[PDB]
Amino acid sequence: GKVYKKVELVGTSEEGLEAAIQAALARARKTLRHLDWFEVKEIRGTIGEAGVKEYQVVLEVGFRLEE
Amino acid sequence: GKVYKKVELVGTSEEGLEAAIQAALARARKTLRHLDWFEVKEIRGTIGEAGVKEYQVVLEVGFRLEE
Amino acid sequence: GKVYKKVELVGTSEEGLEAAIQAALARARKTLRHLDWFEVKEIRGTIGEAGVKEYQVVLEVGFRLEE
Amino acid sequence: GKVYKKVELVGTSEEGLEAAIQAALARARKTLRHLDWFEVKEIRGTIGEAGVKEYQVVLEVGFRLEE
Amino acid sequence: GKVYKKVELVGTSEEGLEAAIQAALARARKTLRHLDWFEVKEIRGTIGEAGVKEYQVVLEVGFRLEE
Amino acid sequence: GKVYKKVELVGTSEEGLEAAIQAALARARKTLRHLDWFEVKEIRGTIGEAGVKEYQVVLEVGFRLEE
Amino acid sequence: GKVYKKVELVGTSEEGLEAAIQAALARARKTLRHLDWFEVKEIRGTIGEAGVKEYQVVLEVGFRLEE
Amino acid sequence: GKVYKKVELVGTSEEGLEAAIQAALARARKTLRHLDWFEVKEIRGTIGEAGVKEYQVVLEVGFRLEE
Amino acid sequence: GKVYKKVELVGTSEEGLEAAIQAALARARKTLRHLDWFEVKEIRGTIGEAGVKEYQVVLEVGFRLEE
Amino acid sequence: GKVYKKVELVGTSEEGLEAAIQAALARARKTLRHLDWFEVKEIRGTIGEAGVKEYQVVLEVGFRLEE
Amino acid sequence: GKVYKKVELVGTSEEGLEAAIQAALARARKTLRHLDWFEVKEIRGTIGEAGVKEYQVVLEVGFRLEE
Amino acid sequence: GKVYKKVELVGTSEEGLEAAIQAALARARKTLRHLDWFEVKEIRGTIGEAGVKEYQVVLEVGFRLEE
Ligand SMILES: Cc1cc2nc3c(=O)[nH]c(=O)nc-3n(C[C@H](O)[C@H](O)[C@H](O)COP(=O)(O)O)c2cc1C
Ligand SMILES: Cc1cc2nc3c(=O)[nH]c(=O)nc-3n(C[C@H](O)[C@H](O)[C@H](O)COP(=O)(O)O)c2cc1C
Ligand SMILES: Cc1cc2nc3c(=O)[nH]c(=O)nc-3n(C[C@H](O)[C@H](O)[C@H](O)COP(=O)(O)O)c2cc1C
Ligand SMILES: Cc1cc2nc3c(=O)[nH]c(=O)nc-3n(C[C@H](O)[C@H](O)[C@H](O)COP(=O)(O)O)c2cc1C
Ligand SMILES: Cc1cc2nc3c(=O)[nH]c(=O)nc-3n(C[C@H](O)[C@H](O)[C@H](O)COP(=O)(O)O)c2cc1C
Ligand SMILES: Cc1cc2nc3c(=O)[nH]c(=O)nc-3n(C[C@H](O)[C@H](O)[C@H](O)COP(=O)(O)O)c2cc1C
Ligand code: NA
Ligand code: NA
Ligand code: NA
Ligand code: NA
Numbered sequence A, B, C, D, E, F, G, H, I, J, K, L: 001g002k003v004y005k006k007v008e009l010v011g012t013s014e015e016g017l018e019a020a021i022q023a024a025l026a027r028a029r030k031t032l033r034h035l036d037w038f039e040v041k042e043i044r045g046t047i048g049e050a051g052v053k054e055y056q057v058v059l060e061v062g063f064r065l066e067e
Helices: A017-031 B017-031 C017-031 D017-031 E017-031 F017-031 G017-031 H017-031 I017-031 J017-031 K017-031 L017-031
Strands: A003-013 A035-048 A051-064 B003-013 B035-048 B051-064 C003-013 C035-048 C051-064 D003-013 D035-048 D051-064 E003-013 E035-048 E051-064 F003-013 F035-048 F051-064 G003-013 G035-048 G051-064 H003-013 H035-048 H051-064 I003-013 I035-048 I051-064 J003-013 J035-048 J051-064 K003-013 K035-048 K051-064 L003-013 L035-048 L051-064
Touching: A003 A017, A003 B017, A017 A035, A017 A051, A017 E003, A017 G035, A017 G051, A035 K017, A051 K017, B003 B017, B003 E017, B017 B035, B017 B051, B017 C035, B017 C051, B035 D017, B051 D017, C003 C017, C003 H017, C017 C035, C017 C051, C017 D035, C017 D051, C017 F003, D003 D017, D003 G017, D017 D035, D017 D051, D017 I003, E003 E017, E017 E035, E017 E051, E017 J035, E017 J051, E035 F017, E051 F017, F003 F017, F017 F035, F017 F051, F017 H003, F035 J017, F051 J017, G003 G017, G003 I017, G017 G035, G017 G051, G017 K035, G017 K051, H003 H017, H017 H035, H017 H051, H017 L035, H017 L051, H035 I017, H051 I017, I003 I017, I017 I035, I017 I051, I035 L017, I051 L017, J003 J017, J003 L017, J017 J035, J017 J051, J017 K003, K003 K017, K017 K035, K017 K051, K017 L003, L003 L017, L017 L035, L017 L051
Parallel strands: none
Antiparallel strands: A003 A051, A003 B003, A003 E003, A035 A051, A035 G035, A035 K035, B003 B051, B003 E003, B035 B051, B035 C035, B035 D035, C003 C051, C003 F003, C003 H003, C035 C051, C035 D035, D003 D051, D003 G003, D003 I003, D035 D051, E003 E051, E035 E051, E035 F035, E035 J035, F003 F051, F003 H003, F035 F051, F035 J035, G003 G051, G003 I003, G035 G051, G035 K035, H003 H051, H035 H051, H035 I035, H035 L035, I003 I051, I035 I051, I035 L035, J003 J051, J003 K003, J003 L003, J035 J051, K003 K051, K003 L003, K035 K051, L003 L051, L035 L051
């Protein structure tokens, strides 16, 4: 009876992996409703002069569809 | 020339796998047009006192984009 | 000593997943002998006005080779 | 804080896929407690004179560990 | 800080693989903004009397989300 | 009701990827009937003094079985 | 001569990924002996009003079997 | 210009893995011509009272198609 | 009706791959009953001064559950 | 007796997929000797105002090691 | 025109996942030039008396090749 | 603190799988130092008039990086 949708996002952060995930979820909840779960598909990033420049976490976000 | 889009849905049902797929497709067709095919990516579910509580079928739905 | 062969078939049905599998196996046994096991590789289908038009079960069929 | 364990089972049935899953879950709940979810990893089976002899559903069962 | 979204499209063409990709991207840029990268997930197609009828390139398109 | 079979071929060409696919399909249609679709599984090749010697496209070809 | 066993656990934590792993390992060492290594299979989680509710790390734990 | 075909076989042997592969290739060369390469997809087997009863090597065999 | 369980083991040996598998199965049969089949998931090992120090075969062992 | 090494390269081109592969192989042969084969692992690219800006082909290059 | 190379490293740390990545990148930049991006392939580790002994992050590092 | 590197090799032998692995490791230790572990990625080979001509084992070799 219930139907969910999954959207694929890429959260980024200079701080770490959790912050990268949280950035994705923060943006997701502005536009999507009934956010339930997430699944990390991929962890990558960019490299700068001091090592990791940007952590990039490719993420699926699952949420309940209405009506 | 033709371009399609794929959306990832999770259909659920207490009855079985086909009903779970049909629940996803029924909801899809309310909002999406030119639904053509589907691809089952994953079959999971929740467990209750009497065994399977809910069947959950993770599904990609392909449809033609307009214009 | 024994050698088996695997053939990849796609069974279809408007009724459900088991019927799709059975359609593949019914056709397989007309031409192939010593059918032993099957492995479902993929579940997909077509969509019509009333939801699932056709279930399509991609299937490997394993059978013993003679001689 | 919570920790879960996953066990891999193979449920079988001459009837169909749901019944195969249910057979696994029925046996699981005799010995395991706090059964929460399952994930189907694989669908296979044996072939007889009348097509499918036995459906075999390879399944992961997730449950909460105590203390 | 930056968040991207990925959408899955299927571009088609009778001419070849690059044209199939380009058809997807051309349609994508009508509706989506800040298109950055793509990832080919799958190459398939239909067969006609003269060989390949239609090339079909399943593609993920990544773009920056605003705000 | 309808049952398809999939055969795995490797098409080769010194020209490019599309030609390699077309070589596989051209040979397929001499012996197989009711060719419907293809799925590229793998792209590889051999290297010579001037770069790519031979493109090799590993391909599944799907066709309807008769009777 | 030596034989190891692998058990699949899911560690959870509201804090982060390392804490989720550590929760799994802490529970593991209460019951299992000769714990040697782990392999992360999957990172997922639940979503709440403030973003990540629970981080869930699916983990294989390898340990030496006795006698 | 050249087109190859791949057939999937399962070689078995009570001796070991190489013998299992050789059993498959021996049977293959009775019926197939221009055998070129093989790819091991899977290694499994049956268990008896003295350990391994039968080694089973699932194998793809590639060969050149004529004309 | 019948339900099986799968356990994941790592057999090791300085001799070779078969011996590594047999070591796993020998230990398995001391504690587990109704051992039926195995599936090799992974082959790895350690390196010493004379090449392979230890072969390590990651293996799933399937057995029938009682009552 | 023979040992090969595989190196992973990313060839790029504004023209197409073959040219991207050829760019990788051209650079490879300046530094590496006894180049034998390649395997395409991934096809991606960047997007510009006119569609595909750059095709990027992630490629494994296999070559014979000396002495 | 541009060609990149990918090298596979395993960074380790007793502190956490980010530190493990950073250790790999720190060592990489001593010897490699034009480091651009990384891709995490695998997360594993060793277990000690107090849980995680060492986090081990298997990582691909991509960098631009010169001239 | 410690960083490892992984190199991908293909060992070959007319004798068997272990010998193929050993050939790769023998060549590796001439040029690489602090060789620790290996992971078999793939088993393939060539076919001759008497069955297996050459066994080919695709192998990752992991070793500790210095300074
Ligand atoms: C990549 C992709 C996958 C498809 N898979 C299937 C398949 O699952 N089974 C099927 O019957 N048709 C499949 N089709 C064909 C579509 O279902 C549909 O019949 C065809 O694309 C025509 O769509 P249209 O008339 O809306 O343009 C596939 C098409 C594409 C683009
Ligand atoms: C690689 C392979 C996979 C098999 N998978 C199954 C399985 O799915 N379930 C099962 O009951 N038997 C399985 N079997 C055993 C066969 O179903 C069959 O019982 C056995 O090969 C003996 O049959 P035969 O007398 O025709 O040689 C498998 C055998 C092989 C070779
Ligand atoms: C996960 C992900 C994958 C990316 N893959 C590529 C790549 O395929 N090739 C490339 O040139 N850039 C790649 N990029 C970088 C983007 O193409 C883009 O240049 C960058 O995100 C900055 O764009 P922005 O200003 O729109 O944020 C990737 C970025 C992310 C988030
Ligand atoms: C599992 C499978 C995969 C398919 N994939 C595609 C797809 O790649 N693209 C497409 O246009 N049609 C796809 N089709 C649809 C077929 O190409 C074909 O149009 C349809 O099955 C009707 O075939 P028939 O008229 O010979 O019975 C697929 C069909 C099946 C069975
Ligand atoms: C299949 C398998 C995988 C292993 N993976 C790792 C690895 O991830 N990192 C590591 O440091 N050790 C790894 N080990 C080695 C063990 O952690 C341990 O150091 C070694 O087996 C010695 O254990 P023992 O003294 O109990 O016999 C692995 C061992 C096996 C059998
Ligand atoms: C990612 C990775 C995978 C490993 N896998 C194994 C394993 O397959 N089996 C094993 O015995 N050791 C494994 N190890 C541990 C190494 O073989 C080695 O024993 C350990 O890293 C100590 O090496 P060192 O003294 O040079 O620092 C692994 C180590 C790493 C980093
Ligand atoms: Na972290
Ligand atoms: Na069903
Ligand atoms: Na092309
Ligand atoms: Na062997």
